[PDB]
Amino acid sequence: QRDLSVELGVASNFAILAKAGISSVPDSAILGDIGVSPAAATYITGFGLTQDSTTYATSPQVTGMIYAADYSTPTPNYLAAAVANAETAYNQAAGFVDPDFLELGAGELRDQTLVPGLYKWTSSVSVPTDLTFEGNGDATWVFQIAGGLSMADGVAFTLAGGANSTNIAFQVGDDVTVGKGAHFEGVLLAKRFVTLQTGSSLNGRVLSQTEVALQKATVNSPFVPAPEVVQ
Amino acid sequence: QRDLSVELGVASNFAILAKAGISSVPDSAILGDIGVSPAAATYITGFGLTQSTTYATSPQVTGMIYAADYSTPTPNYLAAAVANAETAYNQAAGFVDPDFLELGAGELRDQTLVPGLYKWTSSVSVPTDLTFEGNGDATWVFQIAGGLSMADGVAFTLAGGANSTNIAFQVGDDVTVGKGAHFEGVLLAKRFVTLQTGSSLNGRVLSQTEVALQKATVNSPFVPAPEVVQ
């Protein structure tokens, strides 16, 4: 019943957005666009970029387009807006007051089923087992994690009750590690590094203020409807 | 000291942004980008456009021309600019507790305006020069429910250090800048904006319908894109 929605702005048009770089050990599989700013395209590595048709690039690993800060107009200003909007979201998520849960599990989320609400830790958070979100289709969850976030190899996030990963946001102060073959659901608003380890998957988006490393990793972001034109 | 700044988001990258069309009787001079969305480029008229499928250029425009039918990422870039312009219009219309309510019953004759929030529930006219007197951090917002019209040849003048990046006008009905008149500030218009023969504007024009220029100048502040890290 609390509306903990986090407004992403232009950053909802990206599967992965990073300030410093994105790397892939191939083959990753990303559904949605990816972008870096203020970094140049040289900090997007392991993708085999082919530049078009000089505003964006393509890769067999990305279903969508790839954007960097040195590409042609209007890409620099589009990216600037996406990164500014992603910072405003991080801050909004970190800014909500009066948590429903404080230091749950003393930082460890083991065999948990999480009702909707605002969850805060001043520590790092680890997820050694599967994790279930239970709530309806409009329910919202925000995690405020001052430290790192780590998911053990093979753990999976499960949705129950009608829940949608568009309504799940994780704000994390320190590095995020999604373990090998683990499955994440939600929007990751990371202050520092995010690594999706070998053969992990994420339905949601990855928004980092530094670098994103993919290891044979899958990211499926929501469809972006094309603005409809008046002729 | 009330901070009446209006946040423009992506609309600070446009000299003129309009939902339905932009026209020019040439030669106009626009310093800054122009864009229409959701309208197609066929609703940008009089610019002698030349089409890199993401934008067009014109001798009248220092910058780029964008339309909703142009190629990726122009449609999503424009949809952000228009959404951000609407959010700005609603923020300016939403400020509460005006400092000055119905000044002049809508007619601003020989006025010098200290900083603050000005509201009218009527239309407004500016039959003479109008001065804004305040320092370089002072902010003004005008909330006008009706139209806004400037008489021929009048000017908006800046005294005491005033800066027109800190002046915003929210106007519900048509805005008409008379021949040879001079406007200062950000115009957030719900409906039509006409800059008549030889008028000029230091600021931006953000319209929810159409903008028409007649041998007119729109000179917008340039906001640098992030410096590239190589």
XYZ file of C-alpha atoms in Angstrom:
461
model
C 0.000 0.000 0.000
C 2.937 2.444 0.079
C 3.785 3.692 -3.431
C 7.504 3.030 -3.551
C 7.717 3.484 -7.364
C 11.092 4.772 -8.598
C 10.869 7.004 -11.666
C 13.529 6.110 -14.243
C 12.957 8.706 -16.973
C 14.932 8.016 -20.050
C 16.783 5.238 -18.217
C 13.720 3.005 -18.733
C 14.869 2.823 -22.390
C 17.973 0.796 -21.437
C 18.717 -2.724 -20.445
C 22.169 -1.720 -19.248
C 23.446 1.830 -18.677
C 26.865 2.575 -17.225
C 29.145 5.548 -16.750
C 32.552 3.902 -17.069
C 32.115 0.849 -19.287
C 30.413 -2.445 -20.108
C 32.366 -5.657 -20.794
C 31.205 -9.089 -21.923
C 32.789 -12.462 -21.887
C 30.817 -13.882 -24.946
C 28.184 -14.965 -25.532
C 25.993 -12.687 -23.479
C 22.385 -12.115 -24.545
C 20.864 -8.722 -23.859
C 17.317 -7.805 -24.883
C 17.126 -3.970 -24.955
C 19.532 -1.141 -25.627
C 22.796 -0.578 -23.886
C 24.736 2.654 -23.214
C 27.763 4.328 -21.754
C 28.277 7.988 -20.832
C 30.528 9.853 -20.285
C 32.747 6.979 -21.449
C 33.639 6.586 -25.107
C 32.775 3.393 -27.136
C 36.251 2.069 -26.416
C 35.017 1.179 -22.915
C 32.354 -1.206 -24.349
C 34.405 -4.408 -24.745
C 33.772 -7.974 -25.923
C 30.792 -7.113 -28.133
C 32.208 -7.010 -31.633
C 30.578 -3.627 -32.354
C 29.736 -2.631 -35.928
C 28.915 1.091 -36.200
C 25.974 1.959 -38.450
C 23.880 3.766 -40.143
C 27.597 6.800 -36.760
C 24.851 7.286 -34.061
C 24.818 3.806 -32.610
C 26.374 0.333 -33.036
C 25.116 -3.255 -33.177
C 26.350 -6.588 -31.747
C 25.087 -10.171 -32.216
C 24.849 -10.237 -28.383
C 22.412 -7.266 -28.123
C 18.896 -7.258 -29.491
C 18.603 -3.451 -29.780
C 21.146 -0.679 -30.149
C 24.390 0.246 -28.486
C 25.164 3.884 -27.637
C 28.301 5.692 -26.398
C 29.170 9.277 -25.439
C 31.429 9.840 -28.578
C 28.771 8.857 -31.071
C 27.030 11.365 -33.340
C 24.227 13.722 -32.438
C 21.709 13.267 -30.812
C 23.320 10.313 -29.048
C 25.504 12.293 -26.582
C 22.554 14.350 -25.294
C 20.207 11.281 -25.244
C 22.761 9.445 -23.109
C 23.342 12.421 -20.853
C 19.658 12.497 -20.072
C 19.561 8.701 -19.477
C 22.538 8.828 -17.036
C 21.201 11.978 -15.233
C 17.807 10.352 -14.894
C 19.401 7.121 -13.574
C 21.269 9.172 -10.884
C 17.996 10.926 -9.897
C 16.439 7.412 -9.514
C 19.315 6.126 -7.387
C 18.857 9.145 -5.094
C 15.087 8.767 -4.950
C 15.491 5.115 -3.932
C 18.138 5.991 -1.280
C 15.905 8.884 -0.087
C 12.725 7.140 1.093
C 12.230 7.451 4.865
C 10.904 5.144 7.550
C 11.785 1.621 6.476
C 9.403 -1.228 7.081
C 12.359 -3.507 7.716
C 15.679 -2.536 9.254
C 18.639 -4.846 9.134
C 16.466 -7.887 8.215
C 18.406 -11.119 8.739
C 21.391 -9.064 9.887
C 22.253 -8.759 6.186
C 21.611 -12.401 5.081
C 18.410 -13.245 3.216
C 17.990 -16.957 3.690
C 14.798 -18.807 2.672
C 12.945 -15.462 2.636
C 9.586 -14.451 1.269
C 9.329 -10.685 1.123
C 6.131 -8.732 1.417
C 5.930 -5.286 -0.309
C 7.641 -2.400 1.449
C 10.791 -0.450 2.147
C 13.772 -2.551 3.292
C 16.992 -0.934 4.638
C 20.404 -2.268 5.684
C 23.479 -0.371 6.815
C 25.531 -3.462 5.997
C 26.108 -5.486 2.874
C 23.379 -7.994 1.883
C 23.884 -11.650 0.788
C 21.287 -13.990 -0.708
C 22.496 -17.607 -0.122
C 19.211 -19.254 -1.301
C 16.248 -18.556 -3.544
C 14.289 -15.395 -2.719
C 10.560 -14.875 -3.256
C 8.710 -11.561 -3.664
C 5.026 -11.908 -2.793
C 2.563 -9.141 -3.579
C 0.076 -8.008 -6.149
C 0.540 -6.477 -9.588
C 0.787 -2.938 -8.264
C 2.876 -3.703 -5.196
C 6.242 -2.007 -4.845
C 9.524 -2.997 -3.170
C 12.656 -0.867 -2.583
C 15.905 -2.167 -1.024
C 18.307 0.380 0.418
C 21.685 -1.335 0.870
C 24.593 0.740 2.145
C 27.142 -1.965 1.391
C 27.459 -4.612 -1.387
C 24.890 -7.049 -2.693
C 25.806 -10.687 -3.540
C 23.711 -13.623 -4.765
C 25.115 -17.106 -4.340
C 25.692 -19.306 -7.411
C 22.463 -20.735 -8.716
C 19.983 -18.888 -6.477
C 16.810 -17.608 -8.144
C 14.428 -14.706 -7.521
C 10.791 -15.884 -7.790
C 7.698 -13.754 -8.212
C 4.465 -14.677 -6.419
C 1.075 -13.145 -5.824
C 0.929 -11.175 -9.123
C 4.238 -9.268 -8.582
C 6.087 -7.628 -11.496
C 9.818 -6.872 -11.588
C 9.063 -3.359 -12.942
C 8.036 -2.669 -9.323
C 11.214 -4.016 -7.585
C 14.181 -1.624 -7.136
C 17.509 -2.278 -5.460
C 19.656 0.690 -4.509
C 23.152 -0.545 -3.650
C 26.096 1.562 -2.376
C 28.969 -0.943 -3.001
C 29.681 -3.721 -5.603
C 26.971 -6.088 -6.815
C 27.829 -9.703 -7.651
C 25.172 -11.956 -9.195
C 26.554 -15.466 -8.878
C 27.151 -18.014 -11.621
C 23.769 -19.219 -13.073
C 21.788 -17.132 -10.570
C 18.560 -15.410 -11.670
C 17.706 -11.837 -10.642
C 14.409 -9.907 -11.000
C 14.229 -6.102 -10.719
C 15.894 -2.775 -11.415
C 19.499 -2.580 -10.130
C 20.527 1.019 -9.231
C 24.240 0.441 -8.445
C 26.646 3.050 -7.197
C 29.715 1.007 -8.132
C 30.595 -2.160 -9.985
C 28.048 -4.819 -11.174
C 29.194 -8.280 -12.304
C 26.809 -10.801 -13.744
C 28.810 -14.009 -13.366
C 28.919 -16.854 -15.858
C 25.505 -17.862 -17.217
C 23.438 -15.703 -14.806
C 20.230 -13.993 -15.959
C 18.298 -10.877 -15.009
C 14.868 -9.717 -15.937
C 14.904 -5.986 -15.266
C 17.659 -3.459 -15.930
C 21.207 -2.691 -14.748
C 22.014 0.988 -14.051
C 25.538 1.541 -12.735
C 27.533 4.715 -11.835
C 30.734 2.882 -12.794
C 31.206 -0.402 -14.763
C 29.098 -3.459 -15.669
C 30.774 -6.773 -16.355
C 28.781 -9.552 -18.093
C 30.047 -13.186 -18.087
C 27.977 -15.171 -20.669
C 25.011 -13.372 -19.081
C 21.396 -12.713 -20.025
C 19.512 -9.453 -19.416
C 15.875 -9.145 -20.559
C 14.488 -5.601 -20.184
C 10.832 -4.464 -20.770
C 9.625 -3.488 -24.269
C 9.861 0.208 -25.088
C 6.808 1.385 -27.095
C 7.586 3.494 -30.161
C 6.234 7.103 -29.834
C 3.339 7.261 -32.392
C 3.778 9.870 -35.186
C 1.231 12.413 -36.468
C 1.166 12.625 -40.294
C 14.790 34.484 -1.465
C 12.160 31.923 -2.702
C 13.653 29.676 -5.337
C 11.158 29.661 -8.251
C 13.486 27.826 -10.632
C 11.721 25.654 -13.231
C 13.484 22.395 -14.121
C 13.531 21.822 -17.918
C 15.292 18.411 -18.225
C 15.885 17.620 -21.874
C 13.940 20.720 -22.967
C 17.029 22.749 -22.073
C 18.546 21.305 -25.284
C 15.935 23.203 -27.449
C 15.478 26.732 -28.599
C 11.960 25.790 -29.897
C 10.046 22.547 -29.045
C 6.474 22.153 -30.288
C 3.990 19.284 -30.414
C 2.189 20.216 -33.619
C 4.520 22.276 -35.887
C 7.012 25.158 -36.273
C 6.849 27.631 -39.192
C 9.124 30.404 -40.449
C 8.611 33.263 -42.819
C 12.251 33.630 -43.783
C 14.776 34.688 -42.766
C 14.347 33.847 -39.082
C 17.424 33.034 -36.907
C 17.282 30.286 -34.255
C 20.364 29.725 -32.041
C 19.737 26.254 -30.646
C 18.046 23.063 -31.765
C 14.376 22.850 -32.810
C 12.063 19.833 -32.611
C 8.502 18.650 -33.115
C 6.852 15.589 -31.539
C 4.574 13.767 -32.118
C 4.283 15.689 -35.369
C 6.181 14.561 -38.472
C 8.848 16.744 -40.203
C 6.205 17.875 -42.789
C 4.903 20.174 -40.031
C 8.257 22.065 -39.911
C 7.692 24.649 -42.687
C 9.672 27.450 -44.204
C 13.077 26.300 -43.050
C 14.387 24.938 -46.415
C 15.279 21.689 -44.590
C 17.968 19.344 -45.782
C 18.030 15.836 -44.340
C 22.133 11.327 -41.680
C 18.425 10.310 -41.221
C 18.286 11.295 -37.496
C 18.176 15.076 -38.048
C 17.909 17.931 -40.593
C 19.664 21.236 -40.998
C 18.604 24.727 -42.205
C 20.520 27.897 -42.833
C 18.087 29.575 -40.369
C 19.008 27.154 -37.520
C 22.332 27.032 -35.604
C 21.888 23.511 -34.360
C 19.869 20.499 -35.518
C 16.261 20.002 -36.486
C 14.473 16.928 -35.109
C 11.045 15.435 -35.911
C 9.078 12.413 -34.660
C 9.465 10.496 -37.951
C 13.271 10.669 -37.920
C 15.441 7.592 -37.246
C 16.583 6.083 -33.902
C 17.277 7.523 -31.251
C 15.448 10.745 -32.347
C 11.903 9.487 -31.547
C 12.785 8.558 -27.927
C 14.997 11.673 -27.509
C 12.029 13.900 -28.555
C 9.521 11.954 -26.476
C 11.743 12.774 -23.414
C 12.066 16.430 -24.411
C 8.253 16.834 -24.773
C 7.537 14.968 -21.543
C 10.092 17.118 -19.688
C 8.564 20.319 -21.230
C 5.093 19.214 -19.968
C 6.490 18.508 -16.505
C 8.014 22.031 -16.536
C 4.739 23.690 -17.576
C 2.950 21.882 -14.769
C 5.602 22.837 -12.191
C 5.349 26.514 -13.147
C 1.514 26.404 -13.099
C 1.644 24.557 -9.739
C 3.576 26.855 -7.506
C 1.283 28.156 -4.714
C 0.920 31.384 -2.760
C 1.576 34.084 -5.330
C 3.371 37.270 -4.297
C 1.320 39.361 -6.769
C -2.238 38.379 -7.881
C -3.991 40.173 -10.818
C -1.376 42.984 -11.054
C -2.715 45.712 -13.246
C -5.848 43.633 -13.913
C -3.762 41.927 -16.532
C -2.329 45.115 -18.223
C 1.375 45.741 -17.368
C 2.033 49.441 -18.112
C 5.329 51.071 -17.132
C 6.013 48.181 -14.704
C 9.303 47.269 -13.029
C 8.874 43.892 -11.422
C 10.710 42.783 -8.288
C 11.345 38.990 -8.008
C 8.583 36.599 -7.159
C 5.522 34.575 -8.230
C 2.993 36.488 -10.306
C -0.459 35.048 -11.068
C -3.382 36.133 -13.280
C -6.707 34.309 -13.807
C -7.194 36.423 -16.937
C -5.274 37.242 -20.040
C -2.297 39.611 -19.822
C -0.992 42.372 -22.080
C 2.331 44.274 -22.075
C 1.626 47.646 -23.755
C 4.988 49.264 -22.844
C 8.488 48.087 -21.972
C 8.544 45.817 -18.947
C 11.587 45.648 -16.554
C 12.663 42.768 -14.276
C 14.727 44.167 -11.377
C 16.708 41.697 -9.230
C 20.072 40.107 -9.014
C 21.661 37.279 -10.923
C 20.159 34.661 -8.624
C 16.675 36.152 -8.496
C 13.813 34.072 -9.984
C 10.456 35.146 -11.409
C 7.507 32.961 -12.539
C 4.341 34.217 -14.261
C 1.209 31.995 -14.143
C -1.252 33.258 -16.762
C -4.522 31.468 -17.269
C -5.472 33.348 -20.501
C -3.307 34.649 -23.316
C -0.214 36.771 -23.334
C 0.345 39.636 -25.827
C 3.208 42.135 -26.180
C 2.637 45.375 -28.033
C 4.653 46.359 -31.103
C 8.199 47.405 -30.290
C 8.186 46.853 -26.542
C 11.022 45.235 -24.744
C 11.521 43.100 -21.709
C 14.541 44.714 -19.961
C 16.895 43.325 -17.232
C 17.944 45.650 -14.306
C 20.045 44.967 -11.199
C 21.717 41.857 -12.619
C 18.601 39.917 -13.688
C 19.265 36.822 -15.844
C 16.571 35.475 -18.162
C 17.482 31.834 -17.487
C 15.697 32.614 -14.155
C 12.462 34.001 -15.761
C 9.669 31.618 -16.672
C 6.214 32.263 -18.159
C 3.416 29.626 -18.014
C 0.594 30.699 -20.363
C -2.683 28.810 -20.998
C -3.852 30.509 -24.213
C -2.084 31.951 -27.319
C 1.082 34.050 -26.953
C 1.600 36.841 -29.473
C 4.885 38.873 -29.554
C 4.163 42.053 -31.569
C 6.189 43.351 -34.436
C 9.673 44.278 -33.430
C 9.087 43.424 -29.761
C 11.699 41.739 -27.570
C 10.889 38.953 -25.002
C 13.216 37.559 -22.249
C 12.780 34.194 -20.568
C 11.527 30.627 -20.879
C 8.053 30.488 -22.432
C 5.973 27.418 -21.434
C 2.928 27.778 -23.642
C -0.125 25.545 -23.719
C -1.230 26.778 -27.077
C 0.012 28.833 -30.054
C 3.097 31.099 -29.975
C 3.529 33.751 -32.737
C 6.663 35.928 -32.964
C 5.584 38.667 -35.406
C 7.824 40.401 -38.004
C 11.229 41.251 -36.648
C 10.568 40.318 -32.959
C 13.184 38.540 -30.922
C 13.449 36.345 -27.819
C 16.440 35.567 -25.547
C 15.215 32.318 -23.918
C 13.244 29.285 -25.205
C 9.856 28.558 -26.647
C 8.195 25.367 -25.483
C 4.637 24.982 -26.950
C 2.023 22.265 -26.638
C 0.692 23.209 -30.112
C 2.358 25.292 -32.833
C 5.031 28.007 -33.044
C 5.101 30.556 -35.930
C 8.165 32.825 -36.524
C 8.004 35.840 -38.872
C 11.550 37.073 -39.710
C 12.151 36.590 -35.996
C 15.032 35.571 -33.703
C 15.057 32.950 -30.942
C 18.421 32.934 -29.131
C 18.622 30.138 -26.520
C 21.253 29.404 -23.905
C 23.720 26.639 -24.907
C 24.160 23.820 -22.336
C 27.373 21.764 -23.009
C 26.999 17.974 -23.367
C 29.089 15.871 -20.896
C 32.832 15.818 -21.638
C 33.754 12.422 -23.235
C 36.129 10.183 -21.215
C 38.685 8.615 -23.589
